[PDB]
Design a protein around this ligand. Structure first.
Ligand code: NAP
Ligand code: NAP
Ligand code: CL
Lengths: 270, 272
């Protein structure tokens, strides 16, 4: 190892990843955060103890990895600002910009630009993010482990062979938390419909969701098999489940993710 | 962490508490699991390294705490089978059974001061469980602290003022993990329908659910407010939400929890 990582933009996602790295003992001297405004840089400067600058070029100078963490409308401007610094350099660029495809990023940066596109989600802010990654052709294996490692600082990381699967990631893990929020609400309010106080129902619902997710993660069993541990033949759970299967949830979700992916394609910048 | 704990029955709930306790550092030597059939005991003996025995009375013998982890319609006999051994000492008895009210247990055992009802769930295995606890006023504070110390080791604890609250908690967090497992199944198979691999769909689904609960748990913001914060207008997420909102999920879950409670109320007429 020996990687200088520069984050262009000092926003929420950059902060997520930087704090994740710092917390895992990543050398703070090997990190640079550039931001347009000074306020945000105070945090990175004082608390994180990483390098800060308001000059993207200075910031990117000598970096092995440049992470593009600016809002999507600023992505072309920052690229054009760094095209000369990053030209024929073998430097890895990680794009966090939603919707922005790699070929489009290549147009701005050069043709042999080494690009990884990340699709992280909101739970990144609580160190439980799910990130889908797509790697350019130019990206060498070392850089793929590097990209994966950096994004693992905020949660788990998967790869897709084709960049068109990113929109499917966005629809699943990108928009997924919202789905769970909706679910938790419905479940919460059902519990409250019975004689459970709002506070108890809220807490139990969240712990229940947390626990089922933890179990699924740390266990070999499928979610089907884990469901069996909960269900006794002719038991209470089985009756509640029969009702949930009444609602045709697989199909409900298929339409939901389809709507999401369709929208993602329309919003996709190429 | 010093009590001798004997689980009567070694099924799913027993297995998950025990796995949870061991994971928390609980001395395997202080735990005993019994079960009418032999095969289930193998896991406890070989994976957990805890005492196993096919004989309820032998397991209960030295226990400082006895956890009844048999079906609700098997609680009565188990209580009669052990009535004397339990009453003979201040052995704390924790019933996990749904639809077995303390009054019935007080009858089974002829005593009513060492009875705590606990409504745990399977994520206890990973120490991320949720357990409703109930105990009548006849149960002193140190017995209640004991039960709590034990259930707290595998996850959150919530004491409730009435027993029907426990049965409500049973339909929420007791059966809850199954609901989540079902949603996760539906979600990841939907993701596979769109063309993602099984492994990726499973992993992202799992992690997505975890992340959502985490965000929920780490803020005082409601789930609704988090949903808004996460949904931009005209965006990808909003499209999916609009589909989901038409699934009438609030009503689906209300209908589902109630059907769990009514079924619980059916079993309770049966446990005597
Ligand atoms: N949906 C998601 O959770 C997801 C996940 C990961 C990444 N992303 C993408 O990653 C990007 C970051 O999002 P975010 O919410 O973390 O950001 P944010 O907090 O809303 O703002 C990003 C930061 O970039 C800075 N910036 C803007 N123009 C700049 C420039 N020309 N040079 C240097 N810095 C500049 C801004 O600084 P000031 O405004 O303070 O001056 C701002 O603080 C977005 O494009 C987003 O789409 C999305
Ligand atoms: N599982 C859950 O998600 C959950 C959640 C909350 C509460 N609970 C409560 O926990 C209790 C146990 O449920 P579970 O799902 O864990 O049960 P389970 O896996 O179906 O079986 C419990 C075990 O008890 C054994 N048993 C039956 N009669 C016995 C006896 N007379 N003496 C000794 N052992 C006996 C059975 O042995 P054999 O099968 O080998 O005959 C069985 O293995 C229930 O009362 C339930 O209401 C469960
Ligand atoms: Cl150094």
């Amino acid at each position: 190892n020996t990687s200088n990582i520069t984050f262009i933009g000092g926003g929420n996602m950059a902060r997520n990843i930087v704090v994740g790295l710092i917390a895992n003992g990543y050398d703070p001297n090997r990190i640079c955060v550039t931001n347009r405004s000074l306020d945000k840089l105070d945090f990175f400067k004082e608390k994180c103890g990483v390098h800060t600058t308001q000059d993207n070029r200075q910031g990117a100078l000598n970096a092995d990895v440049v992470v593009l963490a600016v809002k999507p409308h600023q992505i072309k401007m920052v690229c054009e600002e760094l095209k000369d610094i990053l030209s024929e350099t073998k430097i890895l660029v990680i794009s966090l910009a939603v919707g922005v495809t790699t070929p489009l990023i290549e147009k701005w940066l050069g043709k042999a630009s080494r690009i990884v596109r990340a699709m992280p989600n909101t739970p990144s802010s609580v160190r439980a993010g799910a990130t889908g990654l797509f790697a350019n052709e130019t990206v060498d294996k070392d850089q793929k482990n590097l990209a994966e490692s950096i994004m693992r600082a905020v949660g788990l990381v998967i790869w897709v062979s084709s960049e068109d699967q990113i929109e499917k990631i966005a629809a699943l893990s990108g928009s997924g938390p919202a789905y769970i929020f909706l679910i938790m609400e419905a479940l919460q309010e059902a519990a409250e419909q019975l004689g459970l106080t709002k506070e108890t129902a809220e807490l139990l619902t969240e712990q229940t969701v947390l626990g089922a997710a933890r179990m699924a993660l740390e266990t070999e069993q499928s979610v089907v098999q884990l469901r069996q541990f909960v269900t006794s033949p002719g038991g209470t759970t089985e009756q509640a489940i029969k009702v949930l299967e009444s609602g045709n949830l697989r199909e409900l979700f298929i339409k939901a993710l389809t709507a999401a992916v369709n929208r993602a394609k329309e919003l996709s910048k190429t």
